[PDB]
């Protein structure tokens, strides 16, 4: 019960980083595609935060 | 210079509708690519599946 | 046709090379190999010496002959073809003529756009009702 | 014929020299072409750039 | 997220608002078009000229 | 100089074949053989494969450059 | 626990029946998907379809 209780905090922290890795990349693509259309860029990125 | 610049590109509403979903399919092809790992990488950078 | 011809004459030139009867530094390995098949494991003096030379010619020909067809008929053919496409597009006149199409498929195209635009309208209505 | 004994001594020298270059600098290509070549396994394009 | 992208397209007045005109980059796309159209007709005169 | 052109040109063509990689059923023997000298007697796996394919390249390059050099400069030259 | 042990026997057993499916897979592999997909070696996407 102690071994498995120690793993709880650094698994949670690793989930926090890995989310910061994924969202920034999806945002790279949102930026390449839709940099010419301003309403669509603000619609899509808000969608990415919602879904994330 | 022509490859970097976009818009309108049609100005009439029935052919605008096909244009948005055709651009959305460009967008979605790059998320499916990126998920598997297979994007057009910029020089001296590192893959998103490598960082996870 | 052009690369098919270059490749015909390149195939004579590679075999025309083989006939000139050269001998690399690396002849020791096969002469040693031959000695093993003879003893440890006349006609035999030249013909086993000859079979030995034959093994090194089996390797060179085993590579260069497929390499000639890949180089010419897969690779250069293709790059030649993609390059030569650009000359067609020089002639202003032909652009109207190139893009001629059958009347049935010109007719269907408009209808198919209309019919899509119509059913995405009705979809949107159905979705608006149950809001 | 005397200058084609010499040639076969060059073939080894560059074989020896490219061999050292490989472990030092394969790393850049590997971490950058990784998902293009399907999360390797032996990476075909990275091998093709050495040749 | 790919699923999400089709949900944008469920309101039918929105196409015009979404694809609003830049207008500066969108304007200059028509001068890039005109110029390459001229560069190509010019090129075709040098091509006839060199017999 | 007619024949200096002919070898100069041919040697350069010889190279652009070299960069296309193939080895069909010939490669078998080297890649069997490295298992006995290395493992029995990954970056590491990438290395040994390059060293294996360098061996059979090294076989044809020890012949093929001499043959091109000799042919245009000696055999067809004395005829010309 | 007697069926969890039975489940263990299942998992191991299904390693010897999937020899049949991988020997007809390799046949497609060799005159198609291995030289189709850049001259494998062991290709990840081929290895994904049998797993």
From Swiss-Prot, chain A:
UniProt name for this protein: Interferon-induced GTP-binding protein Mx2
Residues included from the entire protein: 506 to 557 of 715
Known role: Interferon-induced dynamin-like GTPase with potent antiviral activity against human immunodeficiency virus type 1 (HIV-1). Acts by targeting the viral capsid and affects the nuclear uptake and/or stability of the HIV-1 replication complex and the subsequent chromosomal integration of the proviral DNA. Exhibits antiviral activity also against simian immunodeficiency virus (SIV-mnd). May play a role in regulating nucleocytoplasmic transport and cell-cycle progression.
This protein's encoding gene: MX2
Domain of life: Eukaryota
Family note: Belongs to the TRAFAC class dynamin-like GTPase superfamily. Dynamin/Fzo/YdjA family.
Localization in the cell: Cytoplasm; Nucleus; Nucleus, Nuclear pore complex
Organism of derivation: Homo sapiens (Human)
Expression induction: By type I and type III interferons.
From Swiss-Prot, chains D, G:
Stimuli inducing this protein: By type I and type III interferons.
Main function: Interferon-induced dynamin-like GTPase with potent antiviral activity against human immunodeficiency virus type 1 (HIV-1). Acts by targeting the viral capsid and affects the nuclear uptake and/or stability of the HIV-1 replication complex and the subsequent chromosomal integration of the proviral DNA. Exhibits antiviral activity also against simian immunodeficiency virus (SIV-mnd). May play a role in regulating nucleocytoplasmic transport and cell-cycle progression.
Highest taxon in the source lineage: Eukaryota
Name of the featured protein: Interferon-induced GTP-binding protein Mx2
Signal sequence coordinates: none
Transmembrane region(s): none
Compartment(s) where it occurs, according to its Swiss-Prot or TrEMBL record: Cytoplasm; Nucleus; Nucleus, Nuclear pore complex
Sequence similarity: Belongs to the TRAFAC class dynamin-like GTPase superfamily. Dynamin/Fzo/YdjA family.
